[PDB]
Amino acid sequence: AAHKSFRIKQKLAKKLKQNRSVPQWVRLRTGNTIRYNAKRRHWRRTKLKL
Amino acid sequence: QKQKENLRKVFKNKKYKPLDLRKKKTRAIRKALSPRDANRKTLKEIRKRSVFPQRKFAVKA
């Protein structure tokens, strides 16, 4: 940490803003197939590296 | 639009046209021998197309 760079500050928001759960109403679409997420990150059961 | 449409009327009547206003059509027919200029037939091939023409008959009994 603490000496990142301006990709790995902007890359790390996208692997941060994707760490919500499901939108908390959108399981009332038509044909709701979304229970909880596929990409769902913890941070010791899942690594980043890309 | 009027910032575009005013340009192409005052950029009428020139060659060396503006790049962003030059007919963005294809690749494989822009840079290969324009069609008013690629039918420019040759002299010894427009004399054999002058005097013996294709005649529309039916060779039958």
Partner: protein
């Protein structure tokens, strides 16, 4: 000649395949000396060639390039043939003087394969089995 790029003690596999220091290339120099124009010069086609001289450390030819889009050359229609799209870069595809002659092209029976199109597009033509609709 041409020496085969394997390092320092030569090829593995078989003794059909050992011999290096005399192996000879196939395309003659008069069609290599137009690839070594056509890619260093990104702009122009290739028309013919002719040798001049020879001494022991080079043979060394000339290349008669043609411009492609000088606005003269579109309206010069006795040499209009070469600036359709299908004739450009005629050093690789083998339809210069020597590059025609390199692939074994004529007719008839000193050339009988190559006949199936190009050259060894014979040796994908004749082994092509026709399991019919109705045998």
């Amino acid at each position: 000649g041409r020496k085969r790029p394997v390092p320092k003690g030569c090829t593995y596999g078989k003794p059909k395949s050992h011999g290096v220091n005399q192996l000879k290339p196939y395309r003659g120099l008069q069609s290599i000396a137009e690839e070594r124009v056509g890619r260093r010069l990104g702009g122009l086609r290739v028309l013919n060639s002719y040798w001049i001289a020879q001494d022991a450390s080079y043979k060394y030819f000339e290349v008669i390039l043609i411009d492609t889009h000088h606005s003269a050359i579109r309206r010069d229609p006795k040499i209009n043939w070469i600036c359709k799209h299908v004739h450009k870069h005629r050093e690789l595809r083998g339809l210069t003087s020597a590059g025609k002659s390199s692939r074994g092209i004529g007719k008839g029976y000193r050339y009988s394969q190559t006949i199936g199109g190009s050259r060894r597009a014979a040796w994908k033509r004749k082994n092509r089995e026709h399991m019919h609709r109705k045998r």
